[PDB]
Amino acid sequence: FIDISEEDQAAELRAYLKSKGAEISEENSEGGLHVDLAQIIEACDVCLKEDDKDVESVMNSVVSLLLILEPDKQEALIESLCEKLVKFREGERPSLRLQLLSNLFHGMDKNTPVRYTVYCSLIKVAASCGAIQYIPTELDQVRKWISDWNLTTEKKHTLLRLLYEALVDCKKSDAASKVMVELLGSYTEDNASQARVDAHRCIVRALKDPNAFLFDHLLTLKPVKFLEGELIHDLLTIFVSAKLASYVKFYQNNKDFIDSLGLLHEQNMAKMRLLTFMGMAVENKEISFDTMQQELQIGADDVEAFVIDAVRTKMVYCKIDQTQRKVVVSHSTHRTFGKQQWQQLYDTLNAWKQNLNKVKNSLLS
Amino acid sequence: STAINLNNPESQSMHLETRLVQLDSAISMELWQEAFKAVEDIHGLFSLSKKPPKPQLMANYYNKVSTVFWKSGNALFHASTLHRLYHLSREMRKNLTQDEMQRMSTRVLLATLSIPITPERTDIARLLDMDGIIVEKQRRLATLLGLQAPPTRIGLINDMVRFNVLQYVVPEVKDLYNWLEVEFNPLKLCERVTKVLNWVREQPEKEPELQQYVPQLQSNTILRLLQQVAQIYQSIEFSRLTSLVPFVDAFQLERAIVDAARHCDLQVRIDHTSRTLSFGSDLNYATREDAPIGPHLQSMPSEQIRNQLTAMSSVLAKALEVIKPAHILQEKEEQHQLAVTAYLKNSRKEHQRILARRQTIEERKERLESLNIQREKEELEQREAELQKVR
Amino acid sequence: GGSGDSAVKQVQIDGLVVLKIIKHYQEEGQGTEVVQGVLLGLVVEDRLEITNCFPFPQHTEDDADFDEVQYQMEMMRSLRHVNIDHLHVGWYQSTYYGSFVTRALLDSQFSYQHAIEESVVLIYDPIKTAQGSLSLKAYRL
Amino acid sequence: FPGGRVVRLHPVILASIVDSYERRNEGAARVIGTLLGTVDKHSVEVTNCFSVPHNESEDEVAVDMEFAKNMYELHKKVSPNELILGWYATGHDITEHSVLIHEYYSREAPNPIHLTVDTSLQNGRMSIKAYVSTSMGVPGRTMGVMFTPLTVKYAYYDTERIGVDLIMKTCFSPNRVIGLSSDLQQVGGASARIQDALSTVLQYAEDVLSGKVSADNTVGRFLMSLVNQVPKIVPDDFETMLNSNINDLLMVTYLANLTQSQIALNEKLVNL
C-alpha cells in the first residue's frame, strides 16, 4: 500500500493498489486503465475480484470507499464491496471498511441507501459488537428523517428483524422487536396483512417474557389499537386474563400452540402481579395480611417471599409493616382509566402546589 | 569494609536471614515490638536496596508476614497482604512456574476470608479522645504492606477478582459468594449460605487459616442481612424474625443485633415489652439506620425525607416531565437557539473588533503592566537609598 | 466607582478561569490547604479581569511541601508565549472546609499584597459548604 | 471492532480552545494547540489542553513540539492523568495542513486525534468535529488523510459542568454568586408552573376531541412516581413528623444564630 495523498488520478491511484493485490486484479488494473480512465469498469474491480483471503487490503478498500461514490453511482457501488464482507466471514477488519464510511461524511448521506447498506452489512459482517454501535445513530437518523419511500422503511423494518434475530438476548430482542412493532403500526406495513403475521409473534414475545408484563406496554400506545385481539390473533385474550385473576382463564382460552412452549409457568405469574397490584393500587395503597394471602390463595411466609419478588419488580416498594400494609406504592401495572382520571385530577391538584406555594417562596426570597 | 554497590549476594543473604529470624522470633515468644522493628529494618533496606530488580525470597517473606499478621491486625490489612502475596504468586509463577490447581484454590480461599470478615471498625478510643495520632500510623502500615492508602472491603474482592478469579476458585466455595455478593434475598440468605458454610468449616485440606476467618465472616453475612431488612420491613414480630434466620441460638443473636444497633449500624426496637422489633419509617431520620459511613450490601434504600429532598425533587423531578415529553418546550428552545445564533452573530462582529482591540491590549499589557509592577518592586530601592540620605 | 482602595479596582473572574479551577477542584489538596494557582489578569473597566489561570501544583502526597519555582517560571513563560504575560494579580486556594481565611493565608497574602498592590485573594468554595452562598470569596488586604 | 469511535471532551477543553483564540495568539482565523488527556480503547477522555506557538501559513506550518514537551512536563506534575494525544485547532475542516500537522505529530508517533472547532454562526455547523485518519498506511508520501467519523460529548467531572451550567445561565444573564440557592428555589416552582401548562395541554388534547396517549400511561406513570417521591404518602402521622422535623431544623437554625451572637459577645469584650 501507498498513501492516498499520492497524486490522483483517482482511478489510477486506486488501481496501483490492485497491482499490489492479486494478479487477476492487476491484469484488470492494466486492462481497466488502458481502455479508459474509467468508471464502473475500474470501480467494480476490487469490489468483486478476490481480496485474496486476508483482509489487510482494508487500506486499498478505504481508497475505493471514497473514490467510487462520486465519479459514478454511490447507491449501486456502495452495495458492491459489501457482498464480499459477508462472503469471507471475518468481520473485524471489514468493520473498519464500514466504520470509515458510516454516514454523514465523505459526500452525502443520500437519505438511506447508505444507511440501509452499511447497517445491513454490519449486522451480518460483525457479531453483536459492531451491530450495537449503529443502533442509536440509526434510530436517531430514523427520527431526523423517516423514509417517505415505503419500501426503505420495509427495509429498515427488515434490518430491525435481522437485529432481533442476530440478538439472542431476550430483552434486547423484545426491545428491537417492540421498536420494530412500534414503527410497524405507526407507518409502513400497515398495509394490514404484513402486520397481521407479525401480531402472532408479538403475542409469543409478550406471553413468553413476563417482564413484558402482561398488557401494560400495549395499553400505553398504539400496538393493540391496530393489531386486533378479537380477531384470531387472540391479543386481547391476554387483556382478558390480565384482570381476571386465575390460571383458569389462559388454560381454557388455549391456543394449544402457546400452551405447550410456552405460557404454562407464566399463568401463575400473571395471577401474582395482577392480584398484588389490583389489590394494592385500587385499595389504593394498603391491603391487609390475610387479604393478599386469600387473593393469591397461598401461604403466609410464601407471600412474604412474593412481596420480595414484587419488590425486585418494584411494583411495590417501601418499608413493609408486618401484619398490615403488605404492599404499598411504586405502581407499574395497568389501571387504564384510573390512571387517566388521576392524571385529570393532577393539574387541579398541582394548581395550588405551583401557585400557592410559589406565592410564599418567591415572596420570601 | 564491604564495597556496597551491586553485591546482592551477602546483601540478600543477611536480609532473608534476619527476616526469617526476626519474624519467627517475635511470632514465637509472643513479641511484637521486635517484629515491628524487624519490619521497619527490612523496609529501610528495601529503600536503600531498591537499586536492584528483585530476586527470590520476596514471595516467601511476603506470605510469611501476611500470615503472621492475619489476627493481630484486622483481616482487612491482613487480607490485603494476602492478595499481595497472591499477586506475587503470579509474577513468581511466570518466573516460578507452579503447575498446581490446589495451590490456586488455597490462594483464592485465603483471599476471600481475609476479605469478608469486618464491615466496620469500632473506634471507641477515638470516639473518646481527639483523636490520633492514630491515622498516620495506619497510613504507615499501608505503606509497609506496599499500599499508599487504606485498603477497602469486599471491594477488595472485586479488586482481586477482576482477574480470572470466578474460575480457578474451587467449587466447594464458588457457589457461596454467588449467594453473599451476588444472589438476593434477605429472607433466604442465612438459609442459602448454611451449606457452603458446613462445606468449608471442614478445615484440614482447605487451609485451617480460612476456617478461623469463617465465624466472623458468617457474622458479617448476618450483619449484611440485618441492615437490609430495615428497608424491607417497618416492623416485625420477634417470633417471625427467629424463623427468617437459621442460626445457632436467638439469645445469642439478639445481643449481636443490639450490639450492632448500639454501635449505630441500624435502628431497631428489638428490646421491647412484647419482644417484637420495630425498624420504623423514619421516626427521626438519621444515619444510625443507614450505617453511617459505609454500606456492606446491595443498594436498596426505601424512600426517606431529609432536608432539601422535597425542595430539589420538586425543582428537577417536575422539570424532567416538561423536558422529556413536551410540545411547549422545544419551540421555546428553538427560539432560544435563535437568540443564541444572534449572539454569536453579534459576537463575530465584535470578535473582529476584539481582534484589533484585544491585540492592542495583549501586547501592551506585557509592557505596561510589567512596567507598573517594576515600579512597585523598584520603589523598595527608592525607600532605602532615600532614607539613607536622611541620616 | 466600585473600585478598591489606593492601587486597584474590583475583580472579575472570567468563566474559563473558574472552569480551570474546578479541574483541580478539591483534590490535590483536600485535607491540606494547597495554593492551587495564581490568578493572572489585567486591568479592565472598573475591575480587574482574571482571564486565565495556570495551576501551581506542589508535592501533595498527604502533606504539602514547596517545590522548585522551575514550574512557575517555565509555566508563566508558557502563558507568555501563546497568550499574554506573567500578570499574577492574586491567587486561589479552594481548599478545605467552607470559606475560611486562615492566619497563614493572611501572612502569605501580606507578602503578596505589599509586593503587588493589584491583588485579591480568591477562595473558591464548591459543594463542600452545601453550596450555599458566596462561592467566590474575594478579599484583599 | 476497531479502535476510536467517539470522543468525550469537557467544557474545559473548549475553554482552553476559546482561550487561545481570543487572547489572541495571532488568531485571525486559525489557532492550533496540542490536546491532552487519555483514551479508553474506543473512547477518548480529553480532560484539559493548552496551545503551542503555532503559525499556520498556507504552505508552512510551525509545530514546536519541544514546547509541548515542556508544557507536558509541567502538566504531568499538574495532574498525572494527562498524555500527549494529538492536536486541536479551529476551523475549517480538512485542509493540506491536516497533512502537515499529521507529520509533526507523527514524530510523537501514536495515533493522532484531530479536533477541528468550526466557529461559524450556523446551528447546522457542528461545534467541534473530531477526526482520526484511516490509511494512514505510511510508506507512501507523507500521510494519507481519510478521516473516520467521530462525534463529541462532555465528561470529566460533575461540579465543573455544574461550573459550566453556572456559566450557561450567566451567558443567559448573570446570575451572580450571591443568590444561587434562591435562584434554584424560584425556578423550582417555575418548573411546576410550566408543568401546569403542559399537563393542561395533555388534558386538553382529550378535552377538545381525543388525544392523551401522551399521558395515558406515559406521564401517568411519571406522575405516580413523582407523587411517590415528593411529597411522601399521606397519613397525618407524616404531617406531624414533618412538623417535628421542621421544629428540630428550626431549633438548629435558631442555635446557629445563638452561636453567631456568642461569636460576637466574646469578640467584643476583648476589643473593649
UniProtKB/TrEMBL annotation, chain A:
The protein's UniProt keywords, in alphabetical order, are: Acetylation, Cytoplasm, Initiation factor, Protein biosynthesis
Q: Which SUPFAM superfamilies match?
A: ARM repeat, Winged helix' DNA-binding domain
One cellular component term (GO) for this entry is: eukaryotic 48S preinitiation complex
Q: Which protein family is named in the record?
A: Belongs to the eIF-3 subunit M family. Belongs to the CSN7/EIF3M family. CSN7 subfamily.
**Which BP terms from GO are recorded?**
formation of cytoplasmic translation initiation complex
Q: What is this protein called?
A: Eukaryotic translation initiation factor 3 subunit M
Tell me the subunit arrangement.
Component of the eukaryotic translation initiation factor 3 (eIF-3) complex, which is composed of 13 subunits: EIF3A, EIF3B, EIF3C, EIF3D, EIF3E, EIF3F, EIF3G, EIF3H, EIF3I, EIF3J, EIF3K, EIF3L and EIF3M. The eIF-3 complex appears to include 3 stable modules: module A is composed of EIF3A, EIF3B, EIF3G and EIF3I; module B is composed of EIF3F, EIF3H, and EIF3M; and module C is composed of EIF3C, EIF3D, EIF3E, EIF3K and EIF3L. EIF3C of module C binds EIF3B of module A and EIF3H of module B, thereby linking the three modules. EIF3J is a labile subunit that binds to the eIF-3 complex via EIF3B.
Pfam families in alphabetical order: eIF3m_C_helix, PCI
Cellular compartment(s):
Cytoplasm
- Which HAMAP family does the protein's record reference? eIF3m
Q: Which residues form the PCI domain?
A: 175-334
Signal peptide residues are none
TrEMBL record, chain B:
Q: Which domain of life is it from?
A: Eukaryota
- By what name is this protein known? Eukaryotic translation initiation factor 3 subunit A
Describe its assembly: Component of the eukaryotic translation initiation factor 3 (eIF-3) complex, which is composed of 13 subunits: EIF3A, EIF3B, EIF3C, EIF3D, EIF3E, EIF3F, EIF3G, EIF3H, EIF3I, EIF3J, EIF3K, EIF3L and EIF3M. The eIF-3 complex appears to include 3 stable modules: module A is composed of EIF3A, EIF3B, EIF3G and EIF3I; module B is composed of EIF3F, EIF3H, and EIF3M; and module C is composed of EIF3C, EIF3D, EIF3E, EIF3L and EIF3K. EIF3C of module C binds EIF3B of module A and EIF3H of module B, thereby linking the three modules. EIF3J is a labile subunit that binds to the eIF-3 complex via EIF3B.
Q: Which gene encodes it?
A: EIF3A
Q: What does this protein do?
A: RNA-binding component of the eukaryotic translation initiation factor 3 (eIF-3) complex, which is required for several steps in the initiation of protein synthesis. The eIF-3 complex associates with the 40S ribosome and facilitates the recruitment of eIF-1, eIF-1A, eIF-2:GTP:methionyl-tRNAi and eIF-5 to form the 43S pre-initiation complex (43S PIC). The eIF-3 complex stimulates mRNA recruitment to the 43S PIC and scanning of the mRNA for AUG recognition.
Which residues does the UniProt record annotate as the domain PCI? 101-284
Coiled-coil residue spans: 344-391
Location relative to the cell? Cytoplasm
Q: Which family does it belong to?
A: Belongs to the eIF-3 subunit A family.
Q: Which residues of the full protein are shown?
A: 215 to 605 of 1350
Question: Whose protein is this, by species?
Answer: Oryctolagus cuniculus
From TrEMBL, chain C:
Question: Residues in domain MPN?
Answer: 18-141
User: The organism sits in which domain of life?
Assistant: Eukaryota
Which cellular compartments is it found in? Cytoplasm
Look up the signal peptide feature and give its range: none
| Its biological purpose | Component of the eukaryotic translation initiation factor 3 (eIF-3) complex, which is required for several steps in the initiation of protein synthesis. The eIF-3 complex associates with the 40S ribosome and facilitates the recruitment of eIF-1, eIF-1A, eIF-2:GTP:methionyl-tRNAi and eIF-5 to form the 43S pre-initiation complex (43S PIC). The eIF-3 complex stimulates mRNA recruitment to the 43S PIC and scanning of the mRNA for AUG recognition.
Q: How does it assemble?
A: Component of the eukaryotic translation initiation factor 3 (eIF-3) complex, which is composed of 13 subunits: EIF3A, EIF3B, EIF3C, EIF3D, EIF3E, EIF3F, EIF3G, EIF3H, EIF3I, EIF3J, EIF3K, EIF3L and EIF3M. The eIF-3 complex appears to include 3 stable modules: module A is composed of EIF3A, EIF3B, EIF3G and EIF3I; module B is composed of EIF3F, EIF3H, and EIF3M; and module C is composed of EIF3C, EIF3D, EIF3E, EIF3K and EIF3L. EIF3C of module C binds EIF3B of module A and EIF3H of module B, thereby linking the three modules. EIF3J is a labile subunit that binds to the eIF-3 complex via EIF3B.
Q: Which family does it belong to?
A: Belongs to the eIF-3 subunit H family.
Protein name (database record)? Eukaryotic translation initiation factor 3 subunit H
- UniProt organism field: Oryctolagus cuniculus
Q: Which gene encodes it?
A: EIF3H
Where the shown chain sits in the full protein?
60 to 183 of 366
Automatic annotation (TrEMBL), chain D:
Q: What protein name is recorded for this chain?
A: Eukaryotic translation initiation factor 3 subunit F
Ranges for domain MPN come to 7-137
Q: Which residues are annotated with the PTM Phosphoserine?
A: S173
Q: Which GO terms describe its molecular function?
A: cysteine-type deubiquitinase activity; identical protein binding; metal-dependent deubiquitinase activity; translation initiation factor activity; translation initiation factor binding
Similarity-based family: Belongs to the eIF-3 subunit F family.
Is Protein biosynthesis among the key words of this record? yes
Keywords associated with the record: Cytoplasm, Initiation factor, Phosphoprotein, Protein biosynthesis
Q: Single GO cellular component annotation? A: eukaryotic translation initiation factor 3 complex, eIF3m
- Gene name, Swiss-Prot/TrEMBL: EIF3F
Where it sits in the cell: the answer is:
Cytoplasm
Instruction: Describe its partners and assembly state.
Output: Component of the eukaryotic translation initiation factor 3 (eIF-3) complex, which is composed of 13 subunits: EIF3A, EIF3B, EIF3C, EIF3D, EIF3E, EIF3F, EIF3G, EIF3H, EIF3I, EIF3J, EIF3K, EIF3L and EIF3M. The eIF-3 complex appears to include 3 stable modules: module A is composed of EIF3A, EIF3B, EIF3G and EIF3I; module B is composed of EIF3F, EIF3H, and EIF3M; and module C is composed of EIF3C, EIF3D, EIF3E, EIF3K and EIF3L. EIF3C of module C binds EIF3B of module A and EIF3H of module B, thereby linking the three modules. EIF3J is a labile subunit that binds to the eIF-3 complex via EIF3B.
Q: How is it modified after translation?
A: Phosphorylated. Phosphorylation is enhanced upon serum stimulation.
**Organism encoding this protein:** Oryctolagus cuniculus
Per the UniProt entry, what are the Gene Ontology biological process annotations, in alphabetical order? formation of cytoplasmic translation initiation complex; IRES-dependent viral translational initiation
